[PDB]
Every structure is written in structure tokens, then in C-alpha cells.
């Protein structure tokens, strides 16, 4: 059963990164690289979810979901 490493794409990106610090290295390769810096991530990243952010960054959600699954995560909060 899935228990750990769950990522909700519908909550603010900062909340994701706080819960999963290791996921930041993945996200910066998926159009979220300004959020590498804590100050940026805790400003813009508190307003934008992965779903919202992907539309702004022009990264297709399928690319994000595939990448996250390939690195051990289970994704929730999809449309």
C-alpha cells in the first residue's frame, strides 16, 4: 500500500517542498527553478500549486506526473 511520498498537485508548492525537501531537486528541473531559493519559494510558492505553476511555466502536467512517479512519488489532486 502507498503510505509515504504522496504529492498533492492541488496545494501550494511551498507546502509540498516543506513535507518533501528531496522533491525540490526534481521540481527545479520541471519549471520551478526560481523556487530553489527559499525566499522565492516562500513568496510565489505559497500562492501557486503545481497545477497552477505548470500552466504558468508551460510544463505539461503529464510531464510532471511521469517525472514524479519515476522518482518514487504517488500523485494526487489531479483534475
Of the CA atoms within 13 Å of residue 9, those in its CB half-sphere come to 24
Relative orientation angle of helices 50-57 and 61-70, to the nearest 10 degrees: 120
Full DSSP string of 11-69: SBHHHHHHH-GGGHHHHTTTT-GGGGSHHHHTTGGGT-BHHHHHHHHT--HHHHHHHHH
Data resolution in angstroms: 2.1
Cell numbers for 16, please give them: 509540498
CATH of the domain at 55: 1.10.3910.10
Closest to 75 (Cα-Cα) out of 57, 58, 54 = 54
State the method.
X-ray
Domain that holds residue 48: 1-79
Alpha carbon distance 62, 67 (integer Å): 8
- What's the structural domain count of the chain? 1
Amino acid at each position: 500500500v502507498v503510505m509515504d511520498n504522496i504529492i498533492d498537485v492541488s496545494i501550494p508548492v511551498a507546502e509540498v517542498v516543506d513535507k518533501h525537501p528531496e522533491v525540490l531537486e526534481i521540481l527545479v528541473e520541471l519549471g520551478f527553478k526560481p523556487l530553489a531559493n527559499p525566499l522565492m519559494r516562500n513568496t510565489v510558492g505559497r500562492k501557486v500549486s503545481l497545477k497552477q505553476g505548470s500552466k504558468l511555466a508551460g510544463t505539461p502536467m503529464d510531464k510532471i506526473v511521469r517525472t514524479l512517479e519515476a522518482n518514487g512519488y504517488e500523485v494526487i489532486g489531479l483534475d
